[PDB]
Design an enzyme around this catalytic site. Sequence first.
Site, PDB file in Angstrom:
ATOM      1  N   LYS A  10       2.533   5.135  10.484  1.00  0.00           N
ATOM      2  CA  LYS A  10       1.562   4.021   9.926  1.00  0.00           C
ATOM      3  C   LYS A  10       2.106   3.343   8.659  1.00  0.00           C
ATOM      4  CE  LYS A  10      -2.285   6.934  12.024  1.00  0.00           C
ATOM      5  NZ  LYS A  10      -3.707   7.225  11.728  1.00  0.00           N
ATOM      6  N   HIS A  93      -3.281   0.754  19.217  1.00  0.00           N
ATOM      7  CA  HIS A  93      -3.477   1.889  18.244  1.00  0.00           C
ATOM      8  C   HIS A  93      -5.094   1.380  17.972  1.00  0.00           C
ATOM      9  CE1 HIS A  93      -4.023   4.934  15.106  1.00  0.00           C
ATOM     10  NE2 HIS A  93      -2.934   5.225  15.735  1.00  0.00           N
ATOM     11  N   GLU A  95      -6.464   1.634  15.315  1.00  0.00           N
ATOM     12  CA  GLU A  95      -6.481   1.091  14.070  1.00  0.00           C
ATOM     13  C   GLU A  95      -6.515  -0.483  14.213  1.00  0.00           C
ATOM     14  OE1 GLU A  95      -3.542   3.380  11.928  1.00  0.00           O
ATOM     15  OE2 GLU A  95      -4.991   5.196  11.914  1.00  0.00           O
ATOM     16  N   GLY A 169     -11.942  10.397  11.624  1.00  0.00           N
ATOM     17  CA  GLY A 169     -12.459  10.001  10.520  1.00  0.00           C
ATOM     18  C   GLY A 169     -14.151   9.799  10.460  1.00  0.00           C
TER      19      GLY A 169
END
Lengths: 252, 252
Positions: A10, A93, A95, A169
């Site tokens: 990341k 991904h 994100e 998360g």
Amino acid sequence: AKFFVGGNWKCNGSVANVAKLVDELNAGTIPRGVDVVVAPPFIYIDYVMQHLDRDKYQLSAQNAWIGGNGAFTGEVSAEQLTDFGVPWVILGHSERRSLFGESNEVVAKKTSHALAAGLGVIACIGETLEQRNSGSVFKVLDAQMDALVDEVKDWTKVVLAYEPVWAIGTGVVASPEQAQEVHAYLRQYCAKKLGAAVADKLRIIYGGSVSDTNCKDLSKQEDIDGFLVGGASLKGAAFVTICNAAGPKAKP
Amino acid sequence: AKFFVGGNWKCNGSVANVAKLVDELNAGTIPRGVDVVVAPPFIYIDYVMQHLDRDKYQLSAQNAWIGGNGAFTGEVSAEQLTDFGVPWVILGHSERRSLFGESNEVVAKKTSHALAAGLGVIACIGETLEQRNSGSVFKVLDAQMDALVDEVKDWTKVVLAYEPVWAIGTGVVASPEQAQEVHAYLRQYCAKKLGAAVADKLRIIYGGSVSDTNCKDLSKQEDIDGFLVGGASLKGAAFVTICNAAGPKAKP
């Protein structure tokens, strides 16, 4: 055939910390017959490629543009990555699906473009807690996969990564049994869409929270072929341990 | 005080072509008192930093994330760039405002974050053909600048780049007089918002189509302090010629 472990660093690193992580990775031993890919931020790829042991590790990028070179300030193309000597890219991904609004269609076209430019692709999918709460798991995963199937004809150099975004998360943990349930579902989808032979050889890797604590409980699940590791990839010995979770799934 | 020229390579390059471009740039002579920045794709920054003459050129990135390190797959942070030794970043380029939907607010926060991480910022603004057609030039530019002013307190390490997006890919050319009209407008805005002293020292660079053919006609305009060069930056001798357009605006 080979168990596959990717380390997604990341947006992490510094010059000193990358040097240290590379040294730790080089100190590790990896079993024969496991593919291990490491994905640094773009700026470190040069250094990592030149210092990380090639016998143990291949490089990946964390993203690429949807098309070739051109007037796309800030972006890196798949053509550039291939020419640089990078063999892999992570695309879609969670994100980037979330923060960058990458649609199913964009991920699939990035994937077909990257494959045509000579990369292997770790293509990521996964559904959120809201989608699991609403009874939409199948609808969401089927649509993510349908978009990939529409763009990808040859899956030889694709690795499919499942991210349980509902367990990333949110305060929810995914069990190995929950992971395996999704991977089994994906396997039978792929058998129907691609043929049983392609589906049996496709690596379907797990991209939930993977650590050196839980890696063996996950790696023994029938349809989990490896991992896309997040934060544990920043800790060399822990990451090497995840790579050693292959057991009988290593293909020496 | 110094005339400022940045070369935005955009998403272009290969290992061999970057090596060749760096050699051409190193063959050029630049007048004393001109700041010259070159912005490669992220993967080439290492190579360029190690091979491009530091007496003539500084490095820039073409983008950075809105915040610090973390779970932002594909992104590079301003902290990483500073730690790498990169002194500059381009933020808010028209291609990212459009293709990536970077809002006025996002560009401004990227800018304040980058400044706090130790970078200089080439902050880009500019209005489209539709906005110029609708009589919205002032409304659009004022809003872009107001967002920057809200986030940026110290403009010492900011360079403001005006992109006439109405003259980029539309079949319309911007004249030097049209460029100067906008730059004069921006100058008086900045004097009112920041104070006459800050506005007089701020570099307001022109990011329309800049070549070795038109650079002297533009560089003589009263409020044009330099350039953010696009495709001509890929041709070493042409780019060096643009850098030599400073004339009396070089501050040896």
